[PDB]
Amino acid sequence: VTAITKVEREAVLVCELPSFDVTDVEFDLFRARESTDKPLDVAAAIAYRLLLGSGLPQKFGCSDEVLLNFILQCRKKYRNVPYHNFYHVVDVCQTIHTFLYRGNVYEKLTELECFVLLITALVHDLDHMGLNNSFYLKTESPLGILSSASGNTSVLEVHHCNLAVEILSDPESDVFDGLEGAERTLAFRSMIDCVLATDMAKHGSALEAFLASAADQSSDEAAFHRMTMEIILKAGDISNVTKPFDISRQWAMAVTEEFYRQGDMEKERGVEVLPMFDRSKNMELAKGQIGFIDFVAAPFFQKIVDACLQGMQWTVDRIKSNRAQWERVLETR
């Protein structure tokens, strides 16, 4: 586990560019990436600022140096793919921060759980290659074969967890080293439960388990806390459609290109290419977004907001706002 050098840390500590408020729901990561010729350092600085600003690391014995080392260890494990790169996870971290503190979801969780969520956002897609679980299973790729044999279909999610554990094995980057007993165990278990919950194949059950844990008041508080954590990481993971249109549009372009590259690799392997990943069809970007909004995002955010997270109402408003604009994109032309 190649430890981080003081040089690597300095490159980050120098940033902290003005004109940006990382806690705002209107924060523009794309604008931030284009404000310097070292976007990876700015991205790292944003994550660093969000965590220290929450005041959480300090409270759990995690020094500023260990925090920065952890962030840099995570950064090194992300590939140069169109969407599932370091920027996506920094965005998820920033977004979760807004849900917790602008949406007041922090009231439903302990400080430790909020800390774990912000940390988990940074490890939730470690070493993603730009290919989804279905690709590994459809092509019988070695990792897919292992997943089938071992009994867990969440190919990537288990892989991300393995790497998160690897990073935390280094005392110099173990943001949970200041914890002991039940707290340290909860940090690891909750982190892992949340990453595993990002497999969209569990979307339905996760949402249902949350709504059930939220509805029934005779519900187990511990269960509600864990489910709220899982739902918040999930919400952050599919939050692209809840951002100002220009930002949402850029994220959509990025995910679409990555999907198209998977489709191209599938054509090379001679396997089935779903329309969503078929670059040939030259589909309208707007059509894919409206579809995701109608069948996935809109129902998800409306349900969790009405069931418990009232403070996140703006996500529902923005989704509807963006859907209308996507319609105009197709219309006006």
Add this chain to the structure above:
Amino acid sequence: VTAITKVEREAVLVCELPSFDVTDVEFDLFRARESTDKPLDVAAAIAYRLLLGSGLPQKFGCSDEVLLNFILQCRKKYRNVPYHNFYHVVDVCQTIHTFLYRGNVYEKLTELECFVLLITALVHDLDHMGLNNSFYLKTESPLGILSSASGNTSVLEVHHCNLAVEILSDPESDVFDGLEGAERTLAFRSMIDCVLATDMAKHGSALEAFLASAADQSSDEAAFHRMTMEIILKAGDISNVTKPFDISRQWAMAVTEEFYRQGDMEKERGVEVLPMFDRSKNMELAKGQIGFIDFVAAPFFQKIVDACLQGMQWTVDRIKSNRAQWERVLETR
């Protein structure tokens, strides 16, 4: 010289190429070919639009009709082989157009030279029969014997030049008929020099001379211009790996099938059959593309971009992206 008919020209003029931007570096010729049941006319229409859009034919006294007649006379001379057919030369023409105008290489040449380059792209592989120079020499075929006896082993290249001269000997299809004296001589000599430079046996020497000229501020201007033209036609000729992955992959498959057909004929004739031309060795495409990228394409484009053609940086970027994509294919196999 069987003159082109009005009906033949009309079949091309009726193609409007909806949804295509022939000037874009991501233009998909395969998509254009699958857009109608008359791909040959679409291809001709693409070449026609590229030349007219350059605004060059008009400047040198070449009417729209003569230009179209020329394009059609060239088309009639290409055969139904897997790779070296009419689509390859139209692709080279389109690719060179992007190098000249998207890559700004036009700044290094006169308008006449840019005109000659676009025209030369269309004649550079005339009457190719799907067999390389080595095949003719190995088998001591009539064409190979003539090349040897006459002193020039660029078997096919000299042949393509002969057919180009034939087409231009009729005013009706002579895109250079509006030229006289020195300009006409330069047009023909430069066209011929460029075609002769496509022989890959001269790849290293051609690249070296260009780089030496580019690095020399006192290089003879005429010589530098000539070498720049030769380098640009060569660049267009080996530009497959500088295109979006799927397009690049489709070209690679055509190249392989043509090589396999030569290998089959070599076996029947009992001559040496390189592994690359052997169906039985079923070499993996990923390794084949990475090999060409590492030993030929990457260094060629990086060197010319660094030495003088800074505007073509995107070719280097795409080659890098495609290599990484083939590496992902290997990693997940």
